[PDB]
Write a protein that binds this ligand. Structure first.
Ligand code: CLA
Ligand code: CLA
Ligand code: CLA
Ligand code: CLA
Ligand code: CLA
Ligand code: CLA
Ligand code: CLA
Ligand SMILES: CCCCCCCCCCCCCCCCCC(=O)OC[C@H](CO[C@@H]1O[C@H](CO)[C@H](O)[C@H](O)[C@H]1O)OC(=O)CCCCCCCCCCCCCCCCC
Ligand code: KC2
Ligand SMILES: CC1=C(C#C/C(C)=C/C=C/C(C)=C/C=C/C=C(C)/C=C/C=C(\C)C#CC2=C(C)C[C@@H](O)CC2(C)C)C(C)(C)C[C@H](O)C1
Ligand SMILES: CC1=C(C#C/C(C)=C/C=C/C(C)=C/C=C/C=C(C)/C=C/C=C(C)/C=C/C2=C(C)CCCC2(C)C)C(C)(C)C[C@H](O)C1
Lengths: 42, 178, 170, 25, 181
C-alpha cells in the first residue's frame, strides 16, 4: 500500500462516505434479519 | 530480510523473534499500523476464551450439571436452554473480571500506561506454576499455540454445529454429508 | 536496435531483456504505458491458471473421483456452481489472492520479482542457470497453455466432445 | 453410543465410515 | 565396520542419476547420498533420522507379525476369539472388536508419550547429546564397540527394506485377497 494513497483514503470525505455506508449497512442488515422493531421486546 | 512463515514477503517491521510464536507472519501489516502490546493482549484473550470454549464444547456433551435446563448435548442449544439469570450473572462476572483484572486500565489509551505491565501478564498464577526461568519462553510458546489451535477449532465446531445441528462428538459418530 | 523475434519491428524500449523469455514482442506498446512488473505478474498468473486448466482437462476426463458424478468439465462448472464446490474453490483462490495482492504490492516496490512466490519445496532449481532455464521453460509453457486452454474449451463448444475423443476420430 | 470408530453396520456411521464409503463407490 | 567412503560418508552415491547434495554431513548412519528433493537443506536432520529409524523398527515388527500370522503360527487360545482365518485386515478388525488392539494402542501410546516425547524434545533442544534412535536398550549385550556400524547401518537398511516389504505385502493382500505365503 502506497502511503500517499492511504493518506488520500484517510481524508474526511472518503472516510465519511465509507463510515456512513458502513453504518447504513448495519442498519439495513439489522432491519433485514430483525424487521418491524417498533419496540424493545419484553 | 524475508518473513520465515511467508517467504515471498519481506519481514514485517517491529517483529524480531522476541515474542513467543513469532515467525514473522503479518502479511496485512497490522503490526505496522497498530502497537504490538495491544495486539498480543487481544490475541491472548481471544485464544484463552477459545481454549475455555473448545474445552466446554467438548466437555458439555459428556458431562452435565443436574437439571433439565443443562441436558442439551449441543452447545448452541445449551446457550438458550440454560437459565437466563445465570447467564446474565456470567456476563456481569466477566465484566467484573475484566474491570479489576486489568486494574481500571481498560482501553486503547490507558492499558499499558504502567511500563511494568506486560502483554498477557495480568499477574495470574494461582498455583505459581511459573516459578522456573528456563521453562518460561517454552510456556508462553505452548500457551499461544494452544490458543491459536483452540481458536481455529472452536470456530470450526461452532459453524459445523450450525451446519449439522449436532453436538461435535456425536456429529463425528453420526456423520451426514451435505 | 530491432526486435529479435519480429525483425521489421523496432525493439520496445522497456523490453531490454531483464525478464527471461524477452524477444521484443509488443507491437501495441503495452509496456510503453503500463508497468512491466504488473504485466509479468498478470502473464504468469494467467499462464499458471491455463497450465492447471489444460492438465485438468486431460486428467479430469482420464480419471474422475468416485464421490462425484461423471460429466464434462464445461458442464462441471455449471454443476459445481449449484452443488457448492465451485464456491469453495473460488473462496480459497480469493484467500490466496489476498496475499497475492500483498505480493504484488511488494513487487511494485522492487523488493520482489514479478514471478517469485518463493515456492520450491522439492528444491528442483539448485543453482542459477537451471533456474534461468526453468524460467524460460515456464514462460514458454505458460504462453502455450494459454493458447491451448482456449483451444480445448472452444473445441468443446463447437464439437461437443472432449479432447481425447476428438483425437481418436478427426 | 456403544459402537466403534470404523466398520460399523447399524445406526453408527462415523466420519471414518463416510471417508471409506467416499473412496469405495 | 563403519566403511566411511565405501558404504557411508562423503562421496558415496548408490543412485548416481541424482547427484549427492552438499547438505548431507555423512555423520548419520544410512547416508548413502539419496536426497533428490533436497529435504536435508531445510529440515532438522536429527528429527527425520529418528523418525526414519522408528518407522523402520515399526515396519520390521509389522513384517514379522504379518508373516507369522499369515503363515499360521498362533499363540494357544488365540485362534478362537480372533477368528480361524489368515487375513491380516480381518485379524485387525476382530482384534479391535475384541479389545486387544485398544490395549496395545494404550500401552504403545503410553510408551510413546512417557519417554519418547521427552527423548525427542530433549534430543532436538540439545540437553542430553542423545543420538537419534538411541533409547539405551541393549539387554543381551551384543553391541559394545561394533556400535559405530555393522549394527546401525544394517538396522536402518533392514528398516527401509521392511517398510517396502510391508507396503508391498499389504497392497498385494488388497488386490489379491490372500495373504503372502
Ligand atoms: C428521530 C426519529 C425517529 C425514530 C425514533 C425512529 C425509530 C425507529 N424507526 Mg424510523 N425513520 C425516521 C426517524 C426515526 N425512526 C425517518 C426520518 C425515516 C425516513 C427516512 C424513518 C424510516 C424508517 C423505516 C422505513 C423503518 C424505520 C424503523 C424504525 C425502528 C427501528 C427498528 C430497528 O432498527 O431495530 C433495531 C434492531 C436491532 C437488532 C438493533 C424504530 C422504531 C424500521 C422499523 O422497524 O419500523 C418500525 C423501518 O423499517 N424507520
Ligand atoms: C468459554 C467458557 C465457557 C462458557 C461461556 C460456558 C458456557 C456454559 N456452560 Mg460450560 N464449561 C467450560 C467453559 C465454558 N462454558 C469448560 C472449560 C468446562 C469444563 C470444565 C465446562 C463444563 C460445563 C459443564 C459440565 C456444564 C457446562 C454448562 C454450561 C452452560 C450453563 C452455564 C453453567 O452452568 O456453567 C457451568 C460451567 C462450568 C461447570 C465450568 C466453567 C469453568 C469456566 C471455564 C471458568 C474458568 C475460568 C474463569 C473465567 C476464571 C479465570 C479468571 C482469570 C482470567 C483471571 C453454558 C452454556 C452446563 C450445561 O448447560 O450443560 C450443557 C453444564 O452442565 N459447562
Ligand atoms: C451474589 C451472590 C449470588 C447469589 C445470591 C446467587 C443466587 C443464585 N444463582 Mg448464582 N452466581 C453467582 C452469585 C450468586 N448467585 C456468581 C458469582 C456466579 C458466577 C457467574 C453465578 C452463576 C450462576 C449460574 C450459572 C446459575 C446461577 C443460579 C442461581 C440461582 C440458584 C442457585 C442454586 O441454588 O444453586 C446451588 C448450586 C450450586 C452452588 C452448585 C454449583 C456447582 C459448581 C459451583 C459448578 C462449578 C462452576 C465453576 C466454579 C465456575 C467458575 C467460574 C467463576 C470463577 C467465574 C440463585 C438465584 C442458577 C439459576 O438461575 O437457576 C435458576 C444458574 O443457572 N448462578
Ligand atoms: C481443511 C480445510 C477445508 C475444510 C474444512 C473444507 C470444508 C468443506 N469443503 Mg472444501 N476445500 C478446501 C478446504 C477445506 N474445505 C480447499 C483448500 C479446496 C480446494 C480449493 C476445497 C475444495 C472443495 C470442493 C471442490 C468441495 C469442497 C466441499 C466442502 C464441504 C464438504 C461437506 C462434507 O460433507 O464433507 C465431507 C467430507 C469428507 C467425508 C472428507 C473426504 C475427504 C476426501 C476423501 C479427500 C480426497 C482427496 C482430495 C481430492 C485431496 C485434495 C488435495 C488438494 C487440497 C490439494 C465442506 C464445507 C464440497 C462442497 O461444498 O459440497 C458440500 C465440494 O464439492 N471443498
Ligand atoms: C511445467 C511448467 C512449469 C515450469 C517449468 C515451472 C518453473 C518454475 N516455477 Mg512454477 N508453476 C507452474 C508450472 C511451472 N513452473 C504452475 C502450473 C504453477 C501453479 C501451481 C506454478 C507455481 C509456482 C510458484 C508458486 C513458484 C514457482 C516457481 C518456479 C521456479 C522454480 C523452479 C522449480 O521448482 O520449477 C521446476 C518445476 C518442474 C521441474 C516441474 C515438475 C513437474 C512434475 C513432472 C510433476 C507434474 C505434475 C503431475 C503430472 C501431476 C500428478 C497427477 C497425476 C494424476 C498424474 C521455476 C522457474 C517458484 C519461483 O519462481 O521461485 C524460485 C515459485 O515460487 N512456480
Ligand atoms: C503372550 C501370548 C500368549 C501366551 C503365551 C498364551 C498362553 C496360553 N494361553 Mg492364551 N491367549 C492369548 C495369548 C497368549 N496365550 C491371546 C492374545 C488370547 C486372546 C484370543 C488368548 C486366549 C486364550 C484362551 C481363550 C485360552 C488360552 C489358553 C492358554 C494356555 C494354554 C496352554 C496349554 O494347555 O497348551 C495348549 C497347547 C496346544 C493346544 C498346542 C498343541 C497358555 C498358558 C487356554 C487356557 O487354559 O488358559 C489358561 C485357554 O482356554 N489363551
Ligand atoms: C534388523 C534388526 C535390528 C538390528 C540389527 C538392530 C540394531 C541395533 N539396535 Mg535395534 N530395534 C529393532 C531391530 C534391530 N535393531 C526393532 C525391530 C526394534 C523395535 C522393538 C528396535 C529397538 C531398538 C531400541 C529401543 C534400541 C535399539 C538399539 C540398537 C543398537 C544396539 C543394540 C543391538 O546391537 O541390537 C542388535 C540385536 C539384535 C538384532 C538381536 C537379534 C534378534 C533376532 C534377529 C530376532 C529374530 C526374531 C524372529 C526370528 C524375526 C523373524 C520373523 C520371520 C521369520 C517371520 C543397534 C544399532 C539401541 C541403541 O543404542 O540404538 C542406537 C536401543 O536403545 N533398537
Ligand atoms: C447491557 C447489559 C449489561 C451487560 C454489561 C454487564 C456490566 C458488567 C458489570 C460492570 C462491569 C463494567 C465495569 C464498568 C466500567 C467501569 C470503567 C472504569 O472504571 O473506567 C475507569 C475510568 C478511567 O478514567 C480515566 O482515569 C484516568 C486515571 O488517571 C484519568 O482520570 C482520566 O481522565 C479518566 O478518563 O475511570 C475510573 O478511573 C473510575 C473508576 C470507577 C470504578 C468503580 C466504578 C464503581 C461502580 C459504580 C457502581 C456504583 C453504584 C451505582 C451508583 C448508585
Ligand atoms: C505400496 C507400494 C509398494 C511397495 C513399496 C512395494 C515394494 C516391494 C518390494 C520391496 C521390498 C518387493 C520385493 C516387492 C515385491 C513385488 N511386488 Mg511390490 N510394492 C508395492 C506395491 C505393489 C504393486 C501395486 C504391485 C507390486 C508387485 C510386486 C511383485 C510382482 C511382480 C512385479 O514386480 O510386477 C513383487 C515380486 C506387482 C505385482 O504383480 O504384484 C503381484 C504389482 O502390481 N507391488 N514389492
Ligand atoms: C495458568 C495456570 C492455570 C491453568 C489453566 C487453564 C485452565 C489451562 C487448561 C486449559 C484448556 C482450556 C486448554 C484448551 C484447549 C482447547 C483446544 C486445544 C482443543 C482444540 C481442538 C481443535 C484444535 C480440533 C478441533 C476439532 C474440530 C475443528 C472439528 C471436530 O469435528 C473435531 C475436533 C474437536 C477434534 C492453573 C489453574 C493450573 C493455575 C496455575 O497457577 C496457572
Ligand atoms: C464462458 C464460460 C466458460 C468459459 C471459459 C473460458 C475458460 C474461456 C477461455 C478462453 C480462452 C482462454 C481463449 C483463448 C483464445 C486464444 C487465442 C484466440 C489465441 C490466439 C493466438 C494467436 C493468434 C497467435 C498468434 C501468433 C502465432 C501464431 C505465433 C507467433 C506469435 C503470434 C503472432 C502471437 C466455462 C467453461 C467456465 C463455462 C461457463 O458456463 C461459460
Amino acid at each position: 500500500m502506497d502511503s500517499n494513497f492511504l493518506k488520500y483514503l484517510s481524508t474526511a470525505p472518503v472516510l465519511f462516505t465509507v463510515w456512513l455506508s458502513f453504518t447504513a449497512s448495519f442498519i439495513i442488515e439489522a432491519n433485514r434479519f430483525f424487521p418491524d422493531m417498533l419496540y424493545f421486546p419484553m | 530480510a524475508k518473513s520465515k512463515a511467508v517467504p515471498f514477503l519481506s519481514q514485517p517491521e517491529a517483529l524480531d523473534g522476541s515474542m513467543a510464536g513469532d515467525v514473522g507472519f503479518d502479511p496485512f501489516g497490522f503490526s505496522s499500523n497498530f502497537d504490538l502490546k495491544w495486539l498480543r493482549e487481544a490475541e491472548l484473550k481471544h485464544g484463552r476464551i477459545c481454549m475455555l470454549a473448545a474445552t466446554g464444547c467438548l466437555v458439555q456433551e459428556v458431562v452435565h450439571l443436574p437439571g433439565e435446563a443443562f441436558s442439551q448435548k449441543m452447545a448452541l442449544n445449551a446457550w438458550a436452554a440454560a437459565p437466563r439469570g445465570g447467564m446474565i450473572s456470567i456476563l456481569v462476572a466477566i465484566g467484573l473480571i475484566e474491570l479489576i483484572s486489568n486494574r481500571f486500565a481498560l482501553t486503547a489509551t490507558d492499558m499499558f500506561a504502567n511500563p511494568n505491565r506486560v502483554p498477557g501478564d495480568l499477574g495470574f498464577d494461582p498455583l505459581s506454576l511459573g516459578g522456573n526461568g528456563a521453562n518460561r519462553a517454552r510456556m508462553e510458546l505452548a500457551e499461544i499455540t494452544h490458543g491459536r489451535a483452540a481458536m481455529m477449532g472452536f470456530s470450526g465446531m461452532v459453524h459445523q454445529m450450525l451446519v449439522s445441528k449436532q453436538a461435535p462428538i456425536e456429529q463425528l459418530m453420526h456423520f451426514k454429508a451435505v | 536496435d530491432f526486435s529479435a523475434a519480429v525483425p521489421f519491428l523496432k525493439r520496445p524500449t522497456n523490453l531490454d531483456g531483464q525478464y527471461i523469455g524477452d524477444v521484443g514482442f509488443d507491437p501495441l506498446g503495452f509496456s510503453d504505458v503500463f508497468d512491466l512488473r504488473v504485466l509479468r505478474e498478470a502473464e504468469l498468473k494467467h499462464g499458471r491458471f491455463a497450465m492447471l486448466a489444460t492438465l485438468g482437462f486431460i486428467v479430469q476426463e482420464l480419471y474422475t473421483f468416485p464421490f462425484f458424478p461423471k460429466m464434462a468439465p464445461v458442464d462441471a462448472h455449471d454443476y459445481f456452481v449449484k452443488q457448492g464446490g465451485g464456491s469453495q474453490i473460488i473462496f480459497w483462490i480469493s484467500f490466496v489472492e489476498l496475499f497475492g495482492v500483498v505480493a504484488l504490492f511488494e513487487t511494485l516496490q522492487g523488493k520482489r520479482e514479478p514471478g517469485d512466490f518463493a515456492f520450491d519445496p522439492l528444491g528442483l532449481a539448485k543453482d542459477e542457470a537451471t533456474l534461468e532455464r526453468y524460467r524460460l521453460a515456464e514462460v514458454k509453457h505458460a504462453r502455450l497453455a494459454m493458447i491451448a486452454i482456449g483451444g480445448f474449451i472452444h473445441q468443446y463448444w463447437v464439437t461437443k466432445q472432449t479432447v481425447l475423443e476428438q483425437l481418436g476420430n478427426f | 453410543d456403544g459402537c466403534g470408530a470404523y466398520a460399523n453396520s447399524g445406526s453408527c456411521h462415523t466420519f471414518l465410515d463416510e471417508i471409506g464409503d467416499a473412496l469405495k463407490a | 565396520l563403519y566403511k566411511d567412503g565405501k558404504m557411508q560418508g562423503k562421496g558415496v552415491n548408490i543412485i548416481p542419476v541424482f547427484a549427492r547434495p552438499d547438505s548431507l554431513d555423512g555423520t548419520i548412519p544410512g547416508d548413502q547420498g539419496f536426497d533428490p528433493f533436497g529435504f536435508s537443506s531445510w529440515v532438522n536432520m536429527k528429527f527425520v533420522s529418528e523418525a526414519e529409524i522408528k518407522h523402520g523398527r515399526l515396519a520390521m515388527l509389522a513384517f514379522a507379525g504379518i508373516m507369522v500370522e499369515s503363515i499360521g503360527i498362533s499363540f494357544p487360545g488365540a485362534t478362537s476369539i480372533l477368528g480361524d482365518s489368515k487375513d491380516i485386515f480381518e485379524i485387525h478388525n476382530k482384534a479391535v472388536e475384541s479389545g486387544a488392539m485398544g490395549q496395545i494402542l494404550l500401552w504403545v501410546g503410553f510408551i510413546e508419550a512417557c519417554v519418547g516425547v521427552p527423548a525427542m524434545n530433549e534430543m532436538l533442544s540439545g540437553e542430553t547429546s542423545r543420538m537419534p534412535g538411541d533409547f539405551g536398550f541393549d539387554p543381551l549385550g551384543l553391541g559394545k564397540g561394533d556400535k559405530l556400524a555393522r549394527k546401525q547401518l544394517v538396522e536402518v537398511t533392514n528398516g527401509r527394506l521392511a517398510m517396502l516389504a510391508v507396503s508391498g505385502i499389504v497392497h498385494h493382500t488388497i488386490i489379491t485377497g490372500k495373504g503372502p505365503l
